[PDB]
């Protein structure tokens, strides 16, 4: 299935934060309504934050996370979880290699903010 695509409430601010756990330099693209809205990059094998940003989901609410490592799209896994019918998490893992730890770039989207 398609992974890393979420429908957020439209016109709503959300946080997006990426962590890296790989020898490879990760490039994380966040698209809103099919256009790049943020790009994070970095390298860590200790879960360093490689980017955090507040964005607006715009008129469509469509947010997509893509991850590339040495010119190849990583395989993505994702889900959205809602706690107490209010607090939302859209979660992405990604695999750039063969070990299937799926943590090479980890992306957390959260809303509402404020």
């Amino acid at each position: 299935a398609t992974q890393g695509v979420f429908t957020l409430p439209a016109n709503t601010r959300f946080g997006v934060t990426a962590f890296a756990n790989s020898s490879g330099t990760q490039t994380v693209n966040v698209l809103v309504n099919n256009e790049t809205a943020a790009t994070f990059s970095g390298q860590s094998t200790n879960n360093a934050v490689i980017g955090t940003q507040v964005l607006n989901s715009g008129s469509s609410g469509k947010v997509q996370v893509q991850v590339s490592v040495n010119g190849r799209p990583s395989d993505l896994v994702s889900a959205q979880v809602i706690l107490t019918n209010e607090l939302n998490f859209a979660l992405v893992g990604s695999e750039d290699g063969t070990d299937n730890d799926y943590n090479d770039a980890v992306v957390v989207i959260n809303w509402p903010l404020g």
Partner: peptide, 11 residues
Amino acid sequence: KXXXKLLKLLL
């Protein structure tokens, strides 16, 4: 890194 990375490319 290293091994597993190269084998994945060659296959």
